[model samples]
Target chain A: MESADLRALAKHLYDSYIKSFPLTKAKARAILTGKKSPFVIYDMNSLMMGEDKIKFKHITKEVAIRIFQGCQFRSVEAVQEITEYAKSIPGFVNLDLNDQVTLLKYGVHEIIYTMLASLMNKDGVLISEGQGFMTREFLKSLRKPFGDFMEPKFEFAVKFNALELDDSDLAIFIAVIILSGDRPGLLNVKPIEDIQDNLLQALELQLKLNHPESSQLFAKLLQKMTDLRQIVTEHVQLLQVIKKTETDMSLHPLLQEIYK
Target chain B: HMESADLRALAKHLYDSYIKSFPLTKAKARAILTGKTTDKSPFVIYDMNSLMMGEDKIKFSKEVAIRIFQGCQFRSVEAVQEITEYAKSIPGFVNLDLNDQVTLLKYGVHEIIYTMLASLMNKDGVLISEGQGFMTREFLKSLRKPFGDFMEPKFEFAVKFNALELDDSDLAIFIAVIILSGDRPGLLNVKPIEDIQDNLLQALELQLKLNHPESSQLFAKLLQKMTDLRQIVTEHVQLLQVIKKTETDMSLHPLLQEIYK
Candidate 1:
C-alpha cells in the first residue's frame, strides 16, 4: 500500500470521485443508508493451530485490504523491501532463498491488491482484478518439501503464486509490493479529517457501477484499511525490535527456544 | 536463476534415488528404508497411513522387524510425536533419525520434528530427510560417545525387533546386521547378505552432521505399483510353499518346511 505512486493514485481517485457527485453530504448519507450497500460485506478465512496460541490466518480479504489501506504512498514498496531486508540477515540468508522469496511474494502481492482497491472508488467500474491468486491448482514445481528424522531446527518460509492479470495488473501489483512500505496505510487513509470531495465521489461512483461482488469487496475492505493503518504503525515498532541489536539476546527473548 | 536447473535435476534424481514409491508398502520398501540382506541397520522407518493406502502385504519378516529398530534415531520426544500426528499420507516412511536435529542443536528435545518441518518446506522432501542434512559424518561422531544418548540406543531399538516376533535363525541374522551397520561394534556370529552391504548409514551420517505425502489420485496410482509387487511376492511365496510341500511329502528335505514357516 505504501507504493511511491500511492498518493498520486489516491489524489487521482479523490479528484475523480468528487467530480461525479452533485449531491450533498446529507443526501449521500441518506443514499448510503437507504438500502443494501456494497461496502458492508464481511469476509473471513483462517485456521488456528499450535496449542491454539499460534494462529495462521490465510489473511482474509478483510485483513488483506486493511493491510493495503495502511499503506502510504510508500507502503507496498516498503512491504517488498522488508523481505530483501530479512534475507540480508545472517542465519536467514542461509535458508533456501527461493522459498524465502516465494513466501514473501505472497505477502507482497496481497498488500498490493489491497492498495489498488482505490480503483473501486475512482473509476465508474470495479475495474478488472489482476489474475490474483485465482487458480486452484498450484504449480507442482512451487510446492514446498519437508523431511523426516531431521528435527529440532529453525525454519522460516514464504510462498507466492504467479500474479495473473492478462496484462498490466500483475505488474502494478508487484510494483506496489516493492514500493508500498514507504507510504501511508493501505491506499486511502489520511492522518487528518480533510476528506477530498472528488475522491469520495469517485469511490461512491465506483460502488454504484460495480456489481455486488465489487461493492461488497470494496466496502468490507474500506473499514479494515483504517485498522490496517494502525497495525503498520505498530509494525514499525516490531521492525525496531528485530533490528535493535544485530543478533542480540536482549532482542530475541525466545532466542534459545525460537530456533529449536 | 542458475539454481533453477540444478533444483529441477536434483528433484528428479531424488525422486528416483530416495523416495521409493508413493505410499510405498513395507516389504517392497525394506531395502530402500534399510539396507537389505543385513540386519546391521535399516535405511529408515515407515508405516501405513490406511488413510491413503491398502492393507500391508509383507508380514512380519526378519526384514520388517530389523527396520523398526533403526527408526529410533530421534534424540527428542517431540520429534516422534510430531511424525505420528502431522503426517498427511497413508503408507510413507517416518524418518526419525533426522540429520538437521544432529547439526542444529546437537540433538536436543524437539529433535526430528523440527527437521521434518524444514524438509517439508523444501522441494522433493528428501534433503533434510536423508542425504546430508541431519544424519551426516561429523554429526555421527559428535553423537557417538558423550554429546547425546547412545549407551543403549542399539539395544533399545533392537528390542523392537523381537517385539515383532522372529525365529532364532532369523533373529541371529538381525543381530548380525545391527552389528554391521553401527561400524561393526559387536561380534558377528552369523553373516548373510554380506555382499550388498554398505556402511552408507555411517558414511551418510558422517556426511550429515547435517541434515536430514500423499495423496490421491493416490489409490489409482498405488493400485498399479502394488498389483505388480503383489503378483511378484505372492508368486515367490507360493513357489516357496509348493517347494516346501513337495519336499516334505517326498521326505526330500523336511527340514526346509520349518525354515519356510
Candidate 2:
C-alpha cells in the first residue's frame, strides 16, 4: 500500500477501535492527546518512587473503554473464571500446538536446553544420545527464524559443558517440559488443585526416571519450577506489555514484513 | 488486521515462554548478574577488561556485556544470534585498542547507553520492545545535561557549545555512565547513609550541597533516592545487562548508516 493509503487506514482502524470500546478509547486518546490517561497512572511504590507505577484513581469510563477496545481486555470476573478453566485440563505436559510454538519461538536455546533437562527418562525421543544429532539439527533449524536472538547453531561446547551430556547421557535423563499454554503466572492464580495438575506433568516425567539419582534431581527441579513460576506470576504485567509494539503493527502488512 | 493480531499473539506467546523461565538458567543468570550464594566464579561482574587479560577466566568483553544486556530484555536467542554475528563481522572494528574496539563493536558506549535507557523506561523495566517513555523531549533532555559539551556522533551528535572538539560524540559516553551512575551507582550508593564508596559519593555530596543551596531536608531526601537508584543500578546490573544486550543489535549494522544518514 502507498504511505498515504496506509496512514488513512490506520487512522480509521484506530478510530474505530476506539469507538468500539469507549472506555479504552478515552484512556488511549487521553494518553495520546497528552491529557494523560485516567486508566491507571502509577509509580511502583519504592520509598523513592512511591505510587510511581500504581493506579490509585479509577479510570474514567471513556478512557477505560478506549484503552481496551479490541485490545484483549478481559473482564474483572475472569480472574476466577480462567482459573476454573485451567483446573479442568488433564495430563502431564499437556500442550496445544500454539503453546508449543510460542514457547519454542520465544527462546529456543532455553526451551531446547530446558526441555532436554526437564525430561525424566525418555530414552528414545528427546534429550537422548540417539537423538543428539537430531536434536542439534532441530535446534539449528529453530534458530533460523529467531535470527540473532539465538545462536543459530547449537553451541556444541556449551551444550556439552552446560548440559555436560552426550547422547548416551541424555538417553538416561528424562523430565517432561510442557510448552505452557497458559502464561507463567496464570498457573499460580489457578486453584491449587489445578496447579497440582499442571505440575503433575513434570512429576510424572520425573517418576519415569530410571536413574536413582534423577529422583532427587527432580525434587530440586520441582522446587526450581515453583520458584520460576512465582517469578512470572509476580511480573505477569511485564509479559503483557512487552508486546506493545507488536500489538501496534500486528495488522500492517508492510510492518509485519519489516519486522518479520 | 489478522496479520497484526498474529504478530501480537506470537509476541505474547514469546513473552509467555520468558515468564515461564523456559530457555535459560535462572541460576546461571543470577550468578552472572546478581551473584548467587553457591557461585564459584572467581571474577566479578563489571570486569569488562577481562577480555584482554589473557586469562582463561570467563571475562566478558563489551560484546559479551552487550549480550548480557540483551538477555535482560529477554530477547529470543535467535534475535540475539543475528545481532551477535553482525557485530562480529563489522569492519573498521577489528584490531583496534580494546577500549576502542569495544566501542566500535558495540557502536560506542554512548549508543548502548541511550538505547538501553530508552528500553529500560516505560516497559515494565524488562524492555522487550523499544520503550515509549524514552523519545520524549523530557527523556532526551535527561539523556543530556542542558549546559554541557553534549555533542556526540554516536547518538545523533548534538550541536556543541564549543562545536569543535565535542562534536564527535552523539551522546557523551563518560558523562552518561556517571549520570547513569557508573552503571553500578559509583559505589555512589543512593542511600545517604550508605556512602560506602567515598569518591563518587563525595562528588554527589558536593553536588547535592551546590544543587540544593537552599534546602538541606530536600537535599537529604533526594540524596536517598540517588542512593537507592545507585544501589538499584549497581544491583540492577542484570536488568541493565539485558537491555544493553538488546541495544548492541540496534546500534551495530553497516546498513544502519542510513538511519543516521
Candidate 3:
C-alpha cells in the first residue's frame, strides 16, 4: 500500500477502536468529572456469594470470591468490546470463521491484558470504567493459588505502563494481536499474516512520528508481545487450577469457553 | 513497556555480564590512577630527523614501535574476545545471522573500545599497559608526529564522554547499541540487526532518563558522542594506512591489520 494509504488506514483503525470503546482513562475522566458525576465505586461486597456473607476472622476466601467475581464481570464486558473492536480491524472479518474464532480465542487474553495496562499502574488496575479500583496489596491478600494468578498480570501491567503508550498506538497493537497468524489452529495463515504485517508497518510508522525521541519504542512494544504471551500462558495455568479447586466460584461462560 | 522492576532486572543482568567479561574493577582503576607501573614498555617514539627528511624517509625505532604497537594490539585482541562474549549475552544478538554477527563486530569493536576507554581516562591522558600504568598527554606529545597525533582525539573524546558519568549498566546497553547498528557496511541481514538495535536504543534512552533525570537532553548528547566516536575510528584507520605506507619496517599484529582492512 502507498504510504499515504497506510497512514489513512491507521487513522481509521484508531478512530474506529476509540469510538467504539467506552472507557480509556481520558474518556473516563472526562465523563466522570462532567456536570453530573458518573463515578461509582465498584461494590466488592455486592459481588460476594452466599457463603461469603458470614464474616470470617480471616477474609482470604471472601476476598478471593469477591475479586474473581469482579474479574469475571469485567472480563465478560471486555470480551464483548474486544470482539466488536476485532471486527473493525481491516480484513479481520474476511478470514474463515474457524480461523477468526481461533485467533480471538487465543488472542483475547493477550489483548485484554494489554488493554488492562491502560487502567493500571504500579499499585493496581481500575475496573467498571474507573468506578472500581483494585489495589495490588488487596489482590495479594487473597487465598493461596488464587492470589498468585493476578500477580503476573500486575507485573506485566506495571512494566507495560512504563512504555507510556497512548490510545492510538494501542489501537494498532490490539489489531496486530488479533490478526496474528501464529495462533494455534489457524488455517489460511497467509491472509492473516499479510494483514498483521500491514498493521505492524503502520504501527512502526505511527510510533516513529509520534515518539520520535523514543527511537526504540516500536521494537520495545513488539518485544512486550512476547512477554504478554508468557503472562497469558501463566494465567491459563492458574485458571485451570481454579477451575478444579474453586468449584463454588463461577467463571463467565465466555471465559470458560476460551479457557477450556 | 517494561515496568521499572523489569528494566532494573535487565540492566542488572547486562551489568553483571559486562563485569564478568571485561573485569574492570575500582581496584584496577585505582591502581592505574596511583601510577603503579608494571612493565617497562617503551613508548613508540618517532625519530625527528627521519620525519623531517620527507614522507619517503619517515622512520621510527622499529623495534620499540613494533613492541608498543604489538602490546596494544594484543590487548585489543583480548578485548575482541571479551566483546564477542558480551555481545552474545545481549538478548537477541545470538539470533542474528552468523556473517552479520561478524560484520557488526568488525565495524563496532573499535567504537565500543573507545567508549570503554572513558573509564580509564581523565583530562590529561589514559591508562595503558593493562591498567597498571598511565600514559600522560605530555609524554604522548613528546613522541611527536603520527604516534602522538593518533591518540589525542581519543583522549579528548574520552574526557568529554566520561563527564556523562554513566555506570556499567548504561555502558552495557550502549555497547549493545554499537554492535547491533543497522547502518554498518557489509551486513548480510539488516532487518533483525536493526530490530535488536532499536530495542537497545530504547533501553539506553530509558536508562539515561532514569539515571540522569537532572541532565536534560543527555541522551541526545550521548548519541552525538557516538557519531564523534565514528569519526575518531575513521581517522585512526586513515592514520594506520599512512604509517603502514611510510614505516615499512614496522610490523602490525596480523589480527589488527585484518580488522583495519
Candidate 4:
C-alpha cells in the first residue's frame, strides 16, 4: 500500500460506507423496530405500543424518561451503524479484539454526535425517528435533565453545519473520530494512529481542493472535534444521571457497554 | 529505513532545536541564537521576572503573562514548522504527502514539546536554562489567569511522566510516536502512516522491554500518557478559546489561531 493507492482506497471507503450508507432516522428506526434485515433480536420498543403517539408538550417525568429511552435506543442503533461502517475501512478488522472493543466503547458517543451534527439544519435534530425535529430552544425549554444532555450537542452541530463539510469531509471526519488514537486501553495504538493520520492527510488535501472559497474552513472543522468531545463529556454525565434516577428504565446492554 | 541510533540522533537534534528556539525568559531566545550552552529548565510559559513590581503589579503581571504566553504560542507555531520540515528529512517520513507532513506536525507539536519538556523534569520541577532557573509548581500556580491554569495540569502530568525515568533513546522514539499521530482531522492515507508509526512503536516497546526488564506494565502506561496528552491538549485548546474571545488585546499569531480555532 503506497501512499497514492492508500489515499484512493480511503476515499473509496468514505464514499461507500458514510456517503452511500449513512445512518438516517429511517434506518435507525428500522433497526430499533427490527423491521428490515432483522439484526436486533429483542424488540425493545414493542412495550410502548399504545403510547407511541402520546404527544405531551410539557416535560412530565414519564414523558421525559420515555423520550430519553427512545434517545438511548437511537444512539445505540446509531453507534452500531458507525461500527459497521468502521469495519469497512482497511485494517480495521485486523485490530486486536480488545482494541476493537475499546475503540467502539470510547468512540461511539462522539461518532453519534458527529453524525447527528451532519443531520442538523439551522434549527434542530430530528427526534422520534423523524416524527419531529427538536429545536434547540424547545429542547432547553423542557428543563428536564435530559434536555441538558441534548442541547450542548445541538449547539455544536449548528456551528458545525456552518462549515458546510460535504459528505466526503464528514465521512473522513467520522473515520478519524472512530479510529482516534487517543482512546484509552488501546494495545495496537500506532497502527490505528497511522490510519487516522493517513485519513487526515487525504482529508486535508480534499478540503484544500474542494473549498477554495474558504481558508478558515479546515481549522474550523478541526476545532469542532474539540467541541464535540466536550459535548460528549456532558452527554456521558447525563447518562450517569439517567442510570441513577430512572431505575425502572434499563439501558440497552449494548448502550451500557459502550457508555461504560 | 533509519537505524534506531540515527533516529535517536535526529530526534535529539530536533528537540534541542525546539528548546533552543523557545523564548523562555529574555535570555533563552538570545542564548540559542548566540550559541551558548545553557541548562534549559521550567520551560517557562510565562516570564515572571519582567512583571513590574508596583501597586499596579497584579494588573501588570496579567498583561505580561499574556504577552509571554503569546510568545509561547508563537514558538509552538514556529516549532511545528521546524519539526514538520525536520520530519520530512527523516528517511521514511517523506513517504507521506505534504498534507500529512503538515497535519502530523500541526496536531502533534504541542504533545511533542510537552513530552520533550517532560524530559527536563526532576523531583522539584523542570530545570530552567542557564540562569539558575526552575519552573517550580508554586511559581506556575502563582501566575495570572489562563497562563497559570493552562500550564499547571501539563506540568503535573509531565512530573508523573518523568517519574518513569526514560532515557533519551526511549524518549526520542516516544516523541516520534507523538509526532506521527493520526488523531488529527483531515488525513487520507492512514494505513501507510499507521504502518510507519507501528514499526517505530514495536521497536520502542522492544527496546523498553529489553533495556528495562521490569517494564511490561510501563509500556501500557506510556501509551496511556498519549491519551492523557490528548486530554490535556484539549483543555489547553479550550482555554485558548476563552482567551480568543475575552482578551481582545492579546492577539494570537495567525498560525497558532488557525490550529486552536
Per-candidate TM-score, chain A: 0.27, 0.26, 0.83, 0.76
Docking quality category of candidate 1 according to DockQ thresholds: incorrect
Best of the two (2, 3) by TM-score = 3
Query: Model 4: per-residue lDDT, tens digit, B177-259?
Result: 77777666887678777777776676667667766788667778888888888888888878788887788887766556555
Interface RMSD against the true structure, candidate 3: 24.5
Q: How well is each residue in A190-230 modelled by candidate 3, as lDDT tens digits?
A: 99999988998999998888889997899999999999888
Show the colliding residue pairs in model 3.
A159-B1, A159-B2, A159-B3
Residue A111 CA error for candidate 1 (Å)? 0.7
Model 4 lDDT at residue B250: 77
Rank by TM-score, highest first: 3, 4, 1, 2
- DockQ per model, Cα: 0.01, 0.02, 0.01, 0.01
Give each candidate's fraction of reference contacts reproduced: 0.00, 0.00, 0.00, 0.00
Candidate 4 lDDT at A13 equals 67
Q: Give stretches of model 2 more than 4 Å off.
A: A1-260, B1-31, B40-42, B45-49, B59-252, B255-261
lDDT of 2 at B242: 45
**What TM-score would chain B of candidate 2 score versus the native chain B?**
0.22
| Candidate models: Cα lDDT each | 0.27, 0.29, 0.70, 0.61
- TM-scores of the models, in the given order? 0.21, 0.20, 0.45, 0.42
Candidate 4 lDDT over A1-260, as tens digits, reads 35577568657866666443445534544443336232111122322332344332111135456556556545544654665577677777677757876888788788777778655554555443344445555555444576676667767776876776766676777777878888888898999988887777767777777788888677778887888788778777777786788676663322232223
User: Model 2 Cα displacement at A221 (Å)?
Assistant: 39
Clashes of 1: 103
Best by DockQ: 2
Proportion of native contacts present in model 1: 0.00
